[PDB]
Amino acid sequence: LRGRKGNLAICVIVLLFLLAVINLIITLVIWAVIRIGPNGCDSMEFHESGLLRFKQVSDMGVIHPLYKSTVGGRRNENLVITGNNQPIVFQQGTTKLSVEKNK
């Protein structure tokens, strides 16, 4: 029947509508978890030359540089390797260079 075909078409319309709604929902979740604004997420940006800049503090945990990784710093700037109330130990086998708060 034309009425029944129309009703199944309405069911198709409804399922497409809800599919689009959940697509928009998950897209909002993607937008919000990375905390993206009109400029972008408040984490980082990809400079067009390939330079991965960041925007705020970083907690990198362990770091294992593998290949061609020289920890440097910006031009006319000072590396300030400070341990916030913690020692700093340059270790190699037995050899130790320990810079504690008072020794």
Partner: protein, 96 residues
């Protein structure tokens, strides 16, 4: 439009988030990484077979801060002089 904006912001190329890749262990960074704000760390254990470096165009002012962010001991490797400020110095041997 919103998804194309996401793809433009994060630069979702064919191979992942630009040069950055995310794997089981963690971040694998196939590009340079210059950060504007101070980073944090827990260890830096370079793999055997390479020499971990520290470089700059200026002084390397290793220092320590108390809870009040006041300097107690300092080790400034500059261009001309290598100063070790602090309350002491020591050189020990293995046996003590």
């Amino acid at each position: 439009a919103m998804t194309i904006w996401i793809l433009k912001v994060m630069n979702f190329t064919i191979d992942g988030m630009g040069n950055l890749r995310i794997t089981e262990k963690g971040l694998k960074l196939e590009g340079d990484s210059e950060f504007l704000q101070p980073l944090y760390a827990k260890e830096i254990q370079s793999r055997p077979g390479n020499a971990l470096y520290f470089k700059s165009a200026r002084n390397v002012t290793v220092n320590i801060l108390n809870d009040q962010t006041k300097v107690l001991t300092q080790l400034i490797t500059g261009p001309k002089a290598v100063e070790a400020y602090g309350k002491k110095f020591e050189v020990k041997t293995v046996s003590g």
